[PDB]
Amino acid sequence: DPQSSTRNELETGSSSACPKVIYIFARASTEPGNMGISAGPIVADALERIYGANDVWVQGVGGPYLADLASNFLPDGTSSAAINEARRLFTLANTKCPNAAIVSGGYSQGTAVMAGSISGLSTTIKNQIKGVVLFGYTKNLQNLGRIPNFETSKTEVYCDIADAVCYGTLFILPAHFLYQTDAAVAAPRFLQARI
Numbered sequence: 001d002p003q004s005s006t007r008n009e010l011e012t013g014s015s016s017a018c019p020k021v022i023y024i025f026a027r028a029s030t031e032p033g034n035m036g037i038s039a040g041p042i043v044a045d046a047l048e049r050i051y052g053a054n055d056v057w058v059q060g061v062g063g064p065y066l067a068d069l070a071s072n073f074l075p076d077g078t079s080s081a082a083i084n085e086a087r088r089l090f091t092l093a094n095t096k097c098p099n100a101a102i103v104s105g106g107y108s109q110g111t112a113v114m115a116g117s118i119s120g121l122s123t124t125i126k127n128q129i130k131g132v133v134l135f136g137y138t139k140n141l142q143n144l145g146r147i148p149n150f151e152t153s154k155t156e157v158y159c160d161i162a163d164a165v166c167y168g169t170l171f172i173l174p175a176h177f178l179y180q181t182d183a184a185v186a187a188p189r190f191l192q193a194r195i
Contacts, residue, residue: 001045005033010059018097026061026110034060039107039183046188061086072171077112086117094125101195105133119148131194133187135179141168156190158182
């Protein structure tokens with residue numbers, strides 16, 4: 001499969017051609033584009049082959065989400081700027097396509113983007129988000145395995161045991177990508193079952 005680290009299908013999408021699924025993703029620290037090159041596109045590919053590329057809009061959280069190392073250490077685990085950009089994309093999804101199933105994901109830092117943005121969204125927009133997958137959730141223990149104010153039923157955390165940040169340890173840049181299987185198999189099935 002082509003690997004596209006920049007996906008802007010919500011941004012450029014027409015409210016005259018709303019898809020069945022809108023898939024929004026926040027990448028890990030240091031990853032290129034707005035999708036990164038690991039869990040982001042793996043999930044993108046996996047969903048597009050469940051429903052067809054035409055019936056899924058794939059959107060990265062780019063712009064002011066720079067995915068830098070320093071932001072992991074801030075109280076929220078990422079920047080306010082990144083959180084606000086993700087809020088803006090969720091709102092744009094609801095605005096453009098209120099009847100579409102929103103699903104989203106985050107890997108490492110991108111999970112903090114997801115937690116911080118989604119926790120602040122309206123009842124209406126949250127209800128539109130059918131499922132959220134959090135690979136290497138860096139605030140896992142701190143946030144009690146959930147996104148605040150977002151249904152735990154619609155939320156899945158993926159942690160590998162070699163991932164100490166999932167389990168309270170202060171942030172370290174992951175030396176290895178640990179979520180190939182979770183991203184390829186478990187996550188797209190969890191999302192599909194909520195669409």
